Structure 1
Amino acid sequence: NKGWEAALSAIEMANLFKSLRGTGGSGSSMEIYEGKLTAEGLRFGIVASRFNHALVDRLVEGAIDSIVRHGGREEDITLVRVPGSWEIPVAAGELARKEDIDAVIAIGVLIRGCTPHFDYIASEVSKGLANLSLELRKPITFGVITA
């Protein structure tokens, strides 16, 4: 279930960035920065599409379960629904600019298989999410699948 995996990646970036922005080490050894798998005290945001209802519900199911099971507090989740995959990047941008969220998770299902004639919509969705993460300096996990 990609939903469980995508949530796990987000948890362990919210911890990593929290460590990096903190005070540095004492020197005298090679600094190593790391992210644990404890979600206590963290705020998340989820953006999910509405296409292939059967599949997406299972994915959003895993994401919420993963956050709570790893110690998260269910009141710290904001869920946003959008008509289709083309509208995920713009919604994620709005949710990522709030100062109360630490990571964002994108859930969706693409239409054509793994052997198309190339897909423009799929490229734009992945391309847009990547630029937002770099521009806003905030992790954004990528949890879409292919039909």
Structure 2
Amino acid sequence: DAPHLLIVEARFYDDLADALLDGAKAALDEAGATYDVVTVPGALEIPATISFALDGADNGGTEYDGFVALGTVIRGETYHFDIVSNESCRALTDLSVEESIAIGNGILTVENEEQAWVRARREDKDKGGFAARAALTMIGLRKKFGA
């Protein structure tokens, strides 16, 4: 009946991860939507994890109506920051189009822990909740179009 989504969380920085999740679940809960939660090491494996979910469903496995990506990448002194940020979001967008699925992108790309918390906190900019909401929104348009 109600939409059932998969929340794929890249758990690199534990505390912030809990923040994004707190808001994510909140939004889904309010909307009366259910979900499952899978934890991955870094934002880089988020797109492959959703890929895994798709293949499973095509084997009689759980079928999800939408996904929500949660993660945080903080700018240090190494170029790695761009790469982890670019590849995760790049592969995530290609995925939403090529597989025609509803994806809410909640992967932060800030310069420091300061900025992260302002966006991570639910009582603040609650980006985790904004991502869950977007996913719900997309789940809606997907139906409205007959996709």
Deviation of residue 57 (structure 1)? Answer: 0.3
Q: 2:20 aligns with which of 28, 38, 59?
A: 59
The answer on whether the counterparts of 1:107 and 1:143 sit within 8 Å (CA) in structure 2 is yes
Secondary structure in structure 2 of the residue aligned to 1:44: strand
Deviation string for 1:58-88 (max 9, x for gaps)? 111111111111222xxx3111101111111
Secondary structure in structure 2 of the residue aligned to 1:88: helix
Aligned residue in 1 for 2:102: 139
Unaligned runs of 5+ in 2: 113-147
Q: 2:67 aligns with which of 92, 96, 104?
A: 104
Greater fraction helix: 2
Deviation string for 1:18-52 (max 9, x for gaps)? xxxxxxxxxxxxxxxxxxxxxx6111110001111
Deviation of residue 93 (structure 1)? Answer: 1.5
Aligned residue in 2 for 1:119: 82
Greater Cα radius of gyration, structure 1 or 2: 1
Aligned residue in 1 for 2:39: 81
Deviation of residue 96 (structure 1)? Answer: 3.8
Count of aligned pairs: 104
The answer on whether the counterparts of 2:6 and 2:68 sit within 8 Å (CA) in structure 1 is yes
Q: Percent identity among equivalent residues?
A: 31
Aligned residue in 1 for 2:92: 129
The answer on whether the counterparts of 1:44 and 1:103 sit within 8 Å (CA) in structure 2 is yes
The answer on whether the counterparts of 1:44 and 1:104 sit within 8 Å (CA) in structure 2 is yes
Q: Stretches of 4+ moved more than 3 A in 1?
A: none
The CA RMSD over aligned residues, in Å, is 2.2
The answer on whether the counterparts of 2:43 and 2:107 sit within 8 Å (CA) in structure 1 is no
- Once residues 2 and 46 of structure 2 are traced to their aligned partners in structure 1, the CA distance between those partners, rounded to angstroms, is 26
* Equivalent residue letter for 1:49: A
* Equivalent residue letter for 2:68: I
Unaligned runs of 5+ in 1: 1-39
- Once residues 96 and 106 of structure 1 are traced to their aligned partners in structure 2, the CA distance between those partners, rounded to angstroms, is 15
The answer on whether the counterparts of 1:50 and 1:81 sit within 8 Å (CA) in structure 2 is yes
